[PDB]
Design a protein around this ligand. Structure first.
Ligand SMILES: O=S(=O)(O)OC[C@H]1O[C@@H](O)[C@H](O)[C@@H](O)[C@H]1O
Ligand SMILES: O=S(=O)(O)OC[C@H]1O[C@@H](O)[C@H](O)[C@@H](O)[C@H]1O
Ligand SMILES: [Ca+2]
Ligand SMILES: [Ca+2]
Ligand SMILES: [Cl-]
Ligand SMILES: [Cl-]
Ligand SMILES: [Cl-]
Ligand SMILES: [Cl-]
Ligand SMILES: [Cl-]
Lengths: 485, 485
């Protein structure tokens, strides 16, 4: 009653403008739009980072990812969340929640002492950082191993055909993108052209594990079934479900029933699938009469990207679609579209519909949920997570004044509508070339007023150097922070 | 010194983001960017209307186009500016200016009593509403007759092969788009598939006049040559040159030297050509040492359109390019991109470089030039044109607080960053279907705050119903205005 269920939909690479309730016209997202229409949609909400693993780290620890220098993790990275580190699911466990995760992990698995043996129990993982149940795509959809990991075991593995991966050289006898292009459903760049699983090459080589191979085009069935089973089993008790999409990350291989539903190719059709999958979970909540007393949160790990490694026509068939809305940048960028993402709260018993323009941070989910449940936080716990339950539940309330934005190549700072980008000597020309996204680095400081210049086009750094200095000093204060408030 | 030259570059359908100095990365416009770098670039400047003829009418009469119900004129429409109406070129003539126009007219030509006889002298026209010299594309590039009109005469017309046009039925023996698709340089929709001139079908049928046919791919030479001659001849005297591009209107048929300069097809290559043509006129002013004492204004008649009637791949090869920047809509729309256009002032002897965010109106060019030259205006003259010479010349000065925006299906109103759109029952679904642009009509009133919602996505009408009433009242006051101030 006083402990509502929490379901956190976490989409992969969903851009600010990829929902029809955020202005999309080339794709319809009716299931997600109903949540927004009956809840609050936020226009200035942010992931911690512009790439997956750092934003997932900050969601779960309530702490900026640079404090542990988290970057995009490889398929065999060790777990980046410590087994005694405070986490949002662990926090929820102490008040009686059953916690589950279904879908993408990308937070590392194992201790790192020795390579993960995919044929033994895989630990530590989700179950050691506060999850009671986990059903994972271990790394990313485009990184081997292309298998599911349930709790501690690879699903449907045969002792007769053990599983190994290698990210430096070919092992095993699977066809590859570079040797066998005639077997490919989509062309792939050099990073992505290794072992072929289910007609698509991945990053890295995979040996064995044939019976454990997943089937991309039925991710929507597999994950939604597991999510439905978890909810149904936990229905008599408070539960936390983190539903971690592979959509709309590459390779986009949507179920055949969504193919051609848009004129944007595989990327647009993945948005349709992603919306269907959400409806499956929402309707299960409704039919068990859990929906009005569930805090549903729908959001994204980073901003959007069209061309991310496969020849899936995402850029050729973009049409009129503005995947990042009016905002400059995208995935990997320090401009606004790197972290400014869709963010929807739906909680009928407590949250009246509205639209909030408050500067809001996913990093504050930890402390705001702790506030909702009366959980005190230690002075060293989730140090960046602020109690923002009030603007989270009420569209008229303000939230942050200041928020740091993070990428590997540069840090930035929002202060109200001011946007500051720290200069860097680092060279990231591969983002413009390969990703068709301006990463946003300049060897000069950048300052923008988003009210008049929402697309970050007119650098005001030389017009307001005192403002630049003030924002850089504020960014240093945050980098140096070590306890709460 | 006190009577500077005025050269007004007026581009066809140039979107807010189609210049590299407004953020374009898929096309470079170095000549125009140099004008912005050494002058004022405006970020909130507006044509009066979202279509050609109403915005040209308002440019020349200093009066909103709805006061005469001006709409897109077909090729044989009569002159919409009366021979005794006060006009900006007529105003300039009384102060010692030689006035010329080179390029697109689209303001009508007959007196309306009888159809224009293209084989006789064509009057009234530019010479009857304040121009001393005119070399015209009479209607639009895609409307017959595909001939030039110099002063009162069709250029290179032969009595032995007289010229006739018909917009309702086929006349003459010219091939047509519907009969002879194998002759077309580009595919055409039904409105555009009539008489073939120079390998491209047009709107309407054209008979005779073979020697007077223009050549689209040499418009850049013809118009820049005519503008260079006019400047060269009038160089010893103050002059006003209105240089009215066909670029980047359909059909986009740029000179061969610009083909392939962008990866956007014919539309992108037309932006490059348009930039070359501007440089030709700018460099002629420089060679005659007139550039420093010339007020150069570069702007556009309405917002951008990709698919406007020909299969020129404008939408298929758009790539990452945002022709309207962050703004919703485009050509034909009542949303911001309908009228929010590029606007650059270059006048080194009086105008210091800068970027201005002031709400600015092309309609105010009449009164602001009158102020610059000390010309008093009658109480019934250019009634919507306000003196805004100060923010025109100074990037630090504010201009308008209120501005009405015009389309045939609905009117709108800006008040600071508030945007109000009046409701309408009228049906313009063909804009979405044929033009891939949201025309912006809703049966309900719309109100947006552009500071937080620059893309006009969150209707605030029901949250601030008093603000709606205020702006509707301001809009009616303007509709009822009849004199100046
Ligand atoms: O959303 S993320 O998981 O952070 O994306 C990780 C990315 O790694 C990059 O190195 C690849 O080229 C991308 O294709 C993508 O896999
Ligand atoms: O810039 S404008 O002259 O207003 O464009 C006029 C437009 O009229 C429409 O009926 C045609 O489909 C367009 O192709 C275009 O010619
Ligand atoms: Ca991601
Ligand atoms: Ca136009
Ligand atoms: Cl990285
Ligand atoms: Cl990698
Ligand atoms: Cl490559
Ligand atoms: Cl019209
Ligand atoms: Cl010359």
């Amino acid at each position: 009653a006083e402990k509502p269920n929490i379901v956190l939909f976490y989409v992969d690479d969903l851009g600010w403008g990829d929902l029809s309730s955020y202005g999309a016209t080339e794709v319809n997202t009716p299931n997600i739009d109903a949540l927004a229409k009956n809840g609050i949609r936020f226009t200035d909400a942010h992931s911690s980072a512009a790439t997956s693993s750092p934003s997932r780290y900050s969601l779960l620890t309530g702490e900026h990812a640079f404090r542990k220098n988290i970057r995009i993790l490889k398929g065999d990275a060790p777990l980046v969340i410590s087994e005694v580190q405070k986490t949002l699911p662990k926090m929820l466990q102490t008040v009686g929640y059953r916690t589950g995760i279904v879908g993408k992990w990308h937070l590392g698995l194992g201790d790192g002492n020795t390579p993960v043996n995919w044929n033994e129990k895989v630990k530590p993982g989700p179950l050691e950082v506060g999850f009671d149940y986990s059903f994972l795509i271990p790394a990313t959809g485009d990184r081997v191993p292309s298998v599911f990991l349930e709790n501690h075991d690879v699903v449907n593995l045969e002792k007769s055909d053990p599983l190994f991966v290698n990210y430096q050289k070919k092992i095993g006898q699977r066809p590859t993108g570079y040797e066998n292009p005639e077997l490919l459903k989509q062309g792939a760049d050099e990073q992505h052209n290794k072992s072929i699983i289910n007609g698509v090459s991945r990053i890295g080589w995979m040996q064995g594990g044939e019976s454990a191979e997943w089937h991309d085009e039925t991710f929507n069935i597999v994950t939604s079934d597991k999510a439905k089973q978890f909810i149904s089993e936990s229905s008599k008790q408070p539960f936390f479900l983190l539903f971690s999409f592979h959509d709309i990350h590459v390779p986009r291989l949507p179920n055949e029933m969504f193919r051609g539903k848009t004129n944007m190719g595989a990327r647009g059709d993945s948005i349709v699938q992603m919306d269907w999958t959400t409806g499956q979970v929402v309707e299960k909540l409704r039919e068990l009469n859990l929906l009005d007393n569930t805090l549903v949160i729908f959001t994204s790990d980073n901003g959007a990207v069209l061309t991310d490694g496969y020849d899936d026509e995402a850029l050729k068939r973009i049409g009129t679609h503005k995947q990042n809305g009016p905002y400059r940048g995208g995935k990997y960028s320090i401009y606004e579209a790197g972290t400014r993402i869709p963010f929807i709260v739906h909680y009928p018993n407590r949250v009246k519909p509205g639209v909030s323009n408050s500067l809001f941070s996913q990093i504050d989910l930890y402390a705001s949920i702790a506030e909702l449940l009366g959980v005190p936080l230690e002075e060293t716990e989730a140090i960046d997570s602020q109690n923002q339950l009030s603007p989270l539940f009420d569209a008229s309330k303000l939230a942050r004044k200041t928020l740091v934005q993070e990428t590997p190549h540069a840090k930035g700072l929002r202060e109200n509508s001011w946007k500051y980008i720290r200069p860097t000597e680092k060279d990231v020309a591969w983002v413009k070339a390969k990703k068709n996204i301006d990463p946003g680095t300049s060897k000069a400081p950048q300052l923008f007023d988003l009210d008049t210049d929402p697309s970050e086009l007119h650098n005001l750094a030389a017009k307001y150097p005192d403002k630049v200095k003030l924002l850089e000093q504020k960014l240093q204060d945050i980098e140096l922070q070590s306890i709460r408030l």
